[PDB]
Amino acid sequence: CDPENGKKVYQICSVCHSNDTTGVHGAAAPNLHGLEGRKVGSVPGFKFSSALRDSGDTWTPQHLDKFLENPMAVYPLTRMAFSGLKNEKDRRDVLCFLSKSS
Ligand code: HEC
Protein backbone atom coordinates (compact mmCIF):
# COMPACT_ATOMS: atom_id res chain seq x y z
CA CYS A 1 0.00 0.00 0.00
CA ASP A 2 1.15 3.43 -1.23
CA PRO A 3 -0.58 6.14 0.86
CA GLU A 4 0.89 8.70 -1.58
CA ASN A 5 -1.05 7.24 -4.50
CA GLY A 6 -3.93 6.85 -2.04
CA LYS A 7 -4.06 10.59 -1.39
CA LYS A 8 -4.28 11.16 -5.14
CA VAL A 9 -6.99 8.51 -5.51
CA TYR A 10 -8.84 10.16 -2.61
CA GLN A 11 -9.33 13.34 -4.64
CA ILE A 12 -12.34 11.60 -6.19
CA CYS A 13 -13.97 11.35 -2.74
CA SER A 14 -13.13 14.82 -1.49
CA VAL A 15 -15.85 16.91 -3.14
CA CYS A 16 -18.63 14.91 -1.51
CA HIS A 17 -16.83 13.96 1.74
CA SER A 18 -14.88 15.90 4.30
CA ASN A 19 -12.01 14.36 6.25
CA ASP A 20 -10.81 16.57 9.09
CA THR A 21 -10.94 17.05 12.84
CA THR A 22 -13.96 19.36 12.86
CA GLY A 23 -16.75 16.76 13.00
CA VAL A 24 -18.52 18.73 10.23
CA HIS A 25 -19.68 16.76 7.20
CA GLY A 26 -18.81 17.45 3.57
CA ALA A 27 -20.80 19.08 0.82
CA ALA A 28 -22.75 15.84 0.29
CA ALA A 29 -21.27 13.07 2.46
CA PRO A 30 -20.06 12.31 6.00
CA ASN A 31 -16.73 13.24 7.49
CA LEU A 32 -14.39 10.29 6.93
CA HIS A 33 -12.02 11.17 9.79
CA GLY A 34 -11.93 8.18 12.15
CA LEU A 35 -13.48 5.86 9.54
CA GLU A 36 -11.42 2.71 10.07
CA GLY A 37 -13.25 0.42 12.49
CA ARG A 38 -16.22 2.80 12.86
CA LYS A 39 -19.76 1.41 12.90
CA VAL A 40 -21.50 1.93 9.56
CA GLY A 41 -23.90 4.88 9.42
CA SER A 42 -23.15 6.07 12.96
CA VAL A 43 -21.03 9.25 12.86
CA PRO A 44 -23.25 11.90 14.46
CA GLY A 45 -24.96 14.64 12.51
CA PHE A 46 -25.20 13.01 9.07
CA LYS A 47 -28.56 11.76 7.76
CA PHE A 48 -27.81 8.32 6.34
CA SER A 49 -29.97 6.25 3.99
CA SER A 50 -32.13 3.63 5.69
CA ALA A 51 -29.64 0.92 4.71
CA LEU A 52 -26.70 2.53 6.44
CA ARG A 53 -28.78 4.04 9.25
CA ASP A 54 -30.04 0.57 10.24
CA SER A 55 -26.81 -1.35 9.73
CA GLY A 56 -24.87 -3.09 12.49
CA ASP A 57 -21.82 -3.60 10.28
CA THR A 58 -18.37 -2.12 11.04
CA TRP A 59 -16.06 -0.45 8.49
CA THR A 60 -13.40 -3.15 8.62
CA PRO A 61 -10.76 -3.04 5.85
CA GLN A 62 -12.52 -6.00 4.23
CA HIS A 63 -15.96 -4.34 4.36
CA LEU A 64 -14.61 -1.03 3.09
CA ASP A 65 -12.83 -2.70 0.17
CA LYS A 66 -16.06 -4.42 -0.98
CA PHE A 67 -18.06 -1.18 -0.63
CA LEU A 68 -15.50 0.92 -2.53
CA GLU A 69 -15.44 -1.68 -5.33
CA ASN A 70 -19.22 -1.51 -5.85
CA PRO A 71 -21.23 0.52 -3.30
CA MET A 72 -24.66 -0.67 -4.36
CA ALA A 73 -23.56 -4.32 -4.29
CA VAL A 74 -23.11 -3.86 -0.53
CA TYR A 75 -25.85 -1.34 0.26
CA PRO A 76 -28.18 -1.29 -2.76
CA LEU A 77 -30.25 1.61 -1.47
CA THR A 78 -27.26 3.84 -0.63
CA ARG A 79 -27.26 7.56 -1.48
CA MET A 80 -23.54 7.35 -2.43
CA ALA A 81 -23.64 8.03 -6.20
CA PHE A 82 -20.30 6.40 -7.01
CA SER A 83 -19.60 3.71 -9.60
CA GLY A 84 -16.78 2.22 -7.55
CA LEU A 85 -13.01 1.79 -7.73
CA LYS A 86 -12.47 -1.21 -10.00
CA ASN A 87 -8.66 -1.15 -9.78
CA GLU A 88 -7.44 -3.21 -6.79
CA LYS A 89 -4.36 -1.01 -6.30
CA ASP A 90 -6.47 2.14 -6.07
CA ARG A 91 -8.76 0.54 -3.47
CA ARG A 92 -5.87 -0.69 -1.30
CA ASP A 93 -4.07 2.64 -1.66
CA VAL A 94 -7.02 4.83 -0.71
CA LEU A 95 -7.77 2.46 2.19
CA CYS A 96 -4.17 2.88 3.24
CA PHE A 97 -4.49 6.68 3.08
CA LEU A 98 -7.72 6.40 5.13
CA SER A 99 -6.09 4.24 7.84
CA LYS A 100 -5.85 5.42 11.46
CA SER A 101 -2.03 5.33 10.98
CA SER A 102 -2.48 8.15 8.44
C1 HEC B 1 -20.67 12.08 -3.92
C2 HEC B 1 -21.06 11.93 -5.25
C3 HEC B 1 -19.75 10.95 -3.30
C4 HEC B 1 -18.55 10.53 -3.75
C5 HEC B 1 -17.80 10.95 -5.01
C6 HEC B 1 -18.06 9.55 -2.75
N1 HEC B 1 -18.98 9.40 -1.74
FE1 HEC B 1 -18.86 8.20 -0.09
N2 HEC B 1 -20.70 8.72 0.46
C7 HEC B 1 -21.52 9.64 -0.21
C8 HEC B 1 -22.77 9.71 0.49
C9 HEC B 1 -23.93 10.65 0.05
C10 HEC B 1 -22.71 8.87 1.54
C11 HEC B 1 -23.85 8.53 2.52
C12 HEC B 1 -24.58 7.29 1.94
C13 HEC B 1 -25.89 6.79 2.50
O1 HEC B 1 -26.46 5.83 1.91
O2 HEC B 1 -26.35 7.36 3.52
C14 HEC B 1 -21.41 8.22 1.53
C15 HEC B 1 -20.98 7.28 2.46
C16 HEC B 1 -19.70 6.77 2.51
C17 HEC B 1 -19.17 5.87 3.52
C18 HEC B 1 -19.94 5.35 4.75
C19 HEC B 1 -19.57 6.30 5.91
C20 HEC B 1 -20.11 5.90 7.28
O3 HEC B 1 -19.83 6.73 8.17
O4 HEC B 1 -20.78 4.82 7.35
C21 HEC B 1 -17.89 5.60 3.19
C22 HEC B 1 -16.86 4.68 3.91
C23 HEC B 1 -17.60 6.33 1.96
N3 HEC B 1 -18.73 7.04 1.56
C24 HEC B 1 -16.38 6.38 1.32
C25 HEC B 1 -16.09 7.00 0.12
C26 HEC B 1 -14.83 6.95 -0.57
C27 HEC B 1 -13.58 6.23 0.00
C28 HEC B 1 -14.98 7.63 -1.73
C29 HEC B 1 -13.84 7.87 -2.82
C30 HEC B 1 -13.30 6.65 -3.35
C31 HEC B 1 -16.32 8.14 -1.77
N4 HEC B 1 -16.98 7.75 -0.62
C32 HEC B 1 -16.85 8.90 -2.82
C33 HEC B 1 -21.16 10.41 -1.30
C34 HEC B 1 -20.03 10.27 -2.06
Side-chain angles (χ1 to χ4, degrees), residues 1-3 5-35 37-87 89-91 93-99 101-102:
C1 93
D2 180 22
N5 183 46
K7 184 176 109 153
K8 282 326 199 143
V9 168
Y10 183 76
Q11 277 282 104
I12 208 162
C13 327
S14 66
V15 188
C16 297
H17 288 271
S18 62
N19 171 29
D20 60 52
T21 64
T22 71
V24 175
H25 303 300
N31 199 313
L32 295 183
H33 179 88
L35 173 67
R38 180 163 93 195
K39 188 167 284 191
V40 170
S42 72
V43 62
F46 186 81
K47 176 142 109 163
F48 287 96
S49 69
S50 61
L52 276 71
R53 168 202 75 201
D54 290 341
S55 178
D57 308 322
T58 290
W59 284 122
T60 58
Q62 302 79 0
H63 197 51
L64 266 163
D65 174 67
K66 288 199 190 123
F67 181 72
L68 292 194
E69 190 268 346
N70 189 338
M72 318 176 145
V74 177
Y75 294 120
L77 292 198
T78 183
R79 300 303 305 187
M80 194 163 139
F82 183 66
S83 278
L85 305 165
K86 312 296 193 201
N87 186 316
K89 183 183 199 323
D90 287 348
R91 284 199 305 281
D93 284 347
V94 77
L95 258 78
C96 179
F97 177 60
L98 285 174
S99 76
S101 307
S102 186

